[PDB]
Design a protein around this ligand. Structure first.
Ligand SMILES: NC(=O)c1ccc[n+]([C@@H]2O[C@H](COP(=O)([O-])OP(=O)(O)OC[C@H]3O[C@@H](n4cnc5c(N)ncnc54)[C@H](O)[C@@H]3O)[C@@H](O)[C@H]2O)c1
Ligand SMILES: NC(=O)c1ccc[n+]([C@@H]2O[C@H](COP(=O)([O-])OP(=O)(O)OC[C@H]3O[C@@H](n4cnc5c(N)ncnc54)[C@H](O)[C@@H]3O)[C@@H](O)[C@H]2O)c1
Ligand SMILES: NC(=O)c1ccc[n+]([C@@H]2O[C@H](COP(=O)([O-])OP(=O)(O)OC[C@H]3O[C@@H](n4cnc5c(N)ncnc54)[C@H](O)[C@@H]3O)[C@@H](O)[C@H]2O)c1
Ligand SMILES: NC(=O)c1ccc[n+]([C@@H]2O[C@H](COP(=O)([O-])OP(=O)(O)OC[C@H]3O[C@@H](n4cnc5c(N)ncnc54)[C@H](O)[C@@H]3O)[C@@H](O)[C@H]2O)c1
Ligand SMILES: CCCCCCc1ccc(Oc2ccccc2C)c(O)c1
Ligand SMILES: CCCCCCc1ccc(Oc2ccccc2C)c(O)c1
Ligand SMILES: CCCCCCc1ccc(Oc2ccccc2C)c(O)c1
Ligand SMILES: CCCCCCc1ccc(Oc2ccccc2C)c(O)c1
Ligand code: NA
Lengths: 262, 268, 264, 258
């Protein structure tokens, strides 16, 4: 009855119980998956938000800008799931951009240092996580990252749009590497979801508002910006065996908004 | 406990046991779905092939160019699944293009009457099946059609490519209509699979120039696909379609899912 | 001096002086092109309108659904431009969709016979025109058709959207053929322009939603958009007819103010 | 008579006379444009090379990673074209990626500092150059960047593919900014051309065969002129409704699977 039955999956990116990662985790566990979680910085609070998941799961520290964490990550994951076991799934649900690269801050005024930090964490880290975790993944496995359609420019998102454009490209190359291990690599492009990070993006509020209302309007089946579950289920679909021929790709979990002009 | 358990699903397009629709049907039954089948022309022969499926399934006649078949379709489906029951799934796995519109035949020499028949059967019928069946579909339901990536031109496929481009555009509009029934509409873009249709194009008149190009095309899929592509295995495609028939892609509509080994994401 | 100096170019699609084709012809003539025009159905009326262009141009009858018109087109064009001369450019600026395939008419209620006539005129005719004219075109020549971005679905445009998706695909195959003659094939995807065909998309609400798209277009466009000025689109078509886009084929150039590149 | 007659256009990225920017500059001058050129690193050699252009032109130093070069750029440009005169066109023909992010070097072994430098020079600089130069550009003006279609992954191009993907995203936001000045921003995605940087990536003639094949009108790696003319097209008044966009000067190869 479990879609992810018997699969060992690493899930990064939980910060609150609003986090897309948190809901990915909950739905995965409901579908029989065995998880390992990773958190950044506030492991104290995170450890406790994750206590509210349907089942218990080891929590490892991972700062994707930290070379030492990455070098040790595979070892620490192995310790947590038991030697002789490998990952079946990896969820990258990590993103960051300094305030200067978002909101009403002029596009031209974000210093490259700030952009580079945003691109490091939001795009490059998809590959560096892949580099760490592929040596301990089973054939038939699946890596899934979170995307926000960057095909067109828009207000407020600014340099985070550029980061997602890089991430989409990095994804297609990770797929080439991941293919050597019989592993898939894909992105899920979600509609706007009210999260902690969503909260930080913000005149700029007027625009975000109008964008959101637009999404629900264009989407032929509507879009509930307060429900993370359909996005969570999409990510789990990709972690399962039921999309076995899809890789280097992007699945849109956006109510179909991107397929409609008006 | 099965992916499609308790779902009632119509599956069109079986003609041989190599048909993509045959494998869609088999995997759906393995996952607990209850099927209605539609078939065109050689119904006696199709019943023998559908007899090979794991589970029983009623076989209705449907020529998508027949207005009466389409007008009577919903009523014949209702009769087969019992009144008060609706469908949760529809699979469109139907294609046709006259020989003039494909293969070694010069692109410019396909008469429009031929092209128009191909587009009717291959693209327009997705809308008219949706029109006939949406009134007997449940919310949360899902329509799926079969695609072959037409974003770039290529040898041989010729006017079928134009048909598929039209199909993709039709799908985005079918999704607006289906939206009102709480129903999703998507396409699955498959890599090449060895079916009646496909072998017919290579074996076709090819044994000439288009022959080598087609084979070069086919062998390129496996080469570009980061995880490989096996033309003799339709199951990765059937599963993907089942994934769209299920509740596990609930926020995807008007869209295309690529079941091609990731080949379309790679230039070499 | 002129961008199209010495080029001989066929332009289809003029019905009124609001026609995109009319403005293409004008700018082409201002830039030194010698034109052959083709018109459908109302030829005496069309001559009255093409009289208003800066220069003379033979007017041929061409109904793209008429195999005999296509069969004779090359011969007739060759007589208009004189012995030893060939075409350098062809403009397809032709479209049609019956009222069932557009506006507030339900998408599902359009019979295939109507949809098929629309696709015949709007997409397939691109290929049969290239078929007719490629044998009398010069290496380095250019064929251009008019497009409206169909990558996403939208209110009112309906089955014409499907026709344009077909056209884009046909263009990529026409480029394969044209390339055997050294000829380019491309489309121009224009933003909304106030023409006769545009008038007919609604009826008597579709009119509302079209105004809504209209207003959103100028908004989305980083350089804005004026639906009453065909000239930027005309210039774009002339750019492709010229030698200044010599490595572009089977492709689409967007003359839409950049609107398609912006979400909001 | 000339397509760019009387327009003032800045062209960056010349390093040898095979540079795509060299040929952009040559064709632009042949079309009556008045140029300002910028150069990186080998200024003395570059000067030697721009002497081979059809007309003389001011050479200014610009390392796009140098905040002071960027801060002074507009002033130095106005000094060259004379106060009261503004630019009509800007050409960005600049890129770089460390050898760890390219070739047969494993994708996963390129350190972020290497990737970050490449993105800085190849993607961010398009924005930062526009920020410097938009305040001194005329309405009707045109900014043009060089692209290599990154919509699909491929061998060897590796992390530069990612840079190009970012560049395409950046171009779309620059267009938002440039619209306020009545200025357009677009990219030219070119087919492969035999340049110095092309040489740095390492079959090199095996690549020319494939492209030429797929291109319905063929493709010559030894000829940058069709790419130059395209850029000059975007600099002209003849594509006045195109912005935030990409024009493919690749022989049509990206429209074809085989
Ligand atoms: N919420 C949306 O609408 C939406 C839409 C599309 C895509 N996304 C993407 O989904 C992913 C998750 O974002 P979210 O919406 O759930 O917000 P979130 O704030 O809940 O999660 C962001 C996560 O990034 C992590 N982060 C920042 N720096 C990190 C670092 N050095 N190392 C490890 N983790 C770090 C945070 O700890 C945090 O857990 C992101 O990639 C986001 O861009 C979100
Ligand atoms: N085989 C491949 O490699 C491949 C790849 C991508 C997409 N597709 C698409 O998959 C779908 C099925 O094709 P296939 O490969 O399984 O071959 P197929 O020959 O088994 O399927 C074709 C089906 O369409 C039906 N058909 C033709 N005319 C019809 C009509 N008037 N009414 C109803 N049905 C009609 C046939 O009866 C037949 O069952 C098609 O849409 C095809 O274009 C196939
Ligand atoms: N107006 C816009 O906003 C817009 C935008 C994008 C693309 N387009 C396209 O531009 C092209 C020209 O359309 P328009 O906007 O100038 O309107 P239009 O009404 O002026 O042009 C339509 C033309 O198609 C011709 N036509 C119809 N049936 C024909 C047939 N059998 N044979 C030959 N010609 C036939 C008409 O005679 C007429 O000259 C069309 O392809 C249109 O789809 C228009
Ligand atoms: N040659 C091709 O096949 C091809 C194809 C498509 C796109 N492009 C792009 O065209 C543009 C020109 O490349 P090219 O092939 O002519 O190679 P090139 O080596 O001749 O020119 C590249 C330029 O980048 C400049 N560069 C590197 N770092 C710089 C810095 N800090 N500041 C300023 N300039 C710097 C070099 O000085 C050099 O002039 C590039 O953007 C390239 O990515 C090239
Ligand atoms: C125009 C604004 C877009 C609408 C909301 C969608 C969204 C919300 C949150 C996202 O996560 C981040 C955004 C910026 C920086 C960091 C993160 C994790 C994110 O990547 C996308
Ligand atoms: C030229 C490239 C070779 C690979 C094509 C793969 C393929 C195979 C069969 C397909 O189905 C049809 C194709 C044409 C006509 C009818 C059908 C069902 C189809 O649509 C696609
Ligand atoms: C909601 C959509 C409204 C904006 C569309 C702009 C437009 C205007 C006219 C066009 O030409 C035709 C449209 C339909 C049928 C025939 C033609 C030539 C055309 O193809 C596009
Ligand atoms: C994988 C196929 C081979 C690619 C050939 C085309 C090309 C050649 C040179 C290019 O310029 C650069 C490439 C890398 C780093 C820096 C520059 C300027 C460039 O961006 C693109
Ligand atoms: Na070729």
């Amino acid at each position: 009855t479990g879609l992810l039955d018997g699969k060992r999956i690493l899930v990064s990116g939980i910060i609150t119980d609003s986090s897309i990662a948190f809901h990915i985790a909950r739905v995965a566990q409901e579908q029989g998956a065995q998880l390992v979680l990773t958190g950044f910085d506030r492991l104290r609070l995170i450890q406790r938000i994750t206590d509210r998941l349907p089942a218990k799961a080891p929590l490892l520290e991972l700062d994707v800008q930290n070379e030492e964490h990455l070098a040790s990550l595979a070892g620490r994951v192995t310790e947590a799931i038991g030697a002789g076991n490998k990952l079946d799934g990896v969820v990258h649900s990590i993103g960051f951009m300094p305030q200067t690269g978002m909101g009403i801050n002029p596009f031209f005024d974000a210093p490259y240092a700030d952009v580079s930090k945003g691109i490091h964490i939001s795009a490059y880290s998809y590959a560096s996580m892949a580099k760490a975790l592929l040596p301990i993944m089973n054939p038939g496995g699946s890596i899934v990252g979170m995307d926000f359609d960057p095909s067109r420019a828009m207000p407020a998102y600014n340099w985070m749009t550029v980061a997602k454009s890089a991430l989409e490209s990095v994804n297609r190359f990770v797929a080439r590497e991941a293919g050597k291990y019989g592993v898939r690599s894909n992105l899920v492009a979600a509609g706007p979801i009210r999260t902690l990070a969503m909260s930080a993006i913000a005149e700029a509020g007027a625009q975000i508002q109008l964008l959101e209302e637009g999404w629900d309007q264009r989407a032929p089946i509507g879009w509930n910006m307060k429900d993370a579950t359909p996005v969570a289920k999409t990510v789990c679909a990709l972690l399962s065996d039921w999309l076995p021929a899809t890789t280097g790709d992007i699945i849109y979990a956006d109510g179909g908004a991107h397929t409609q002009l008006l």
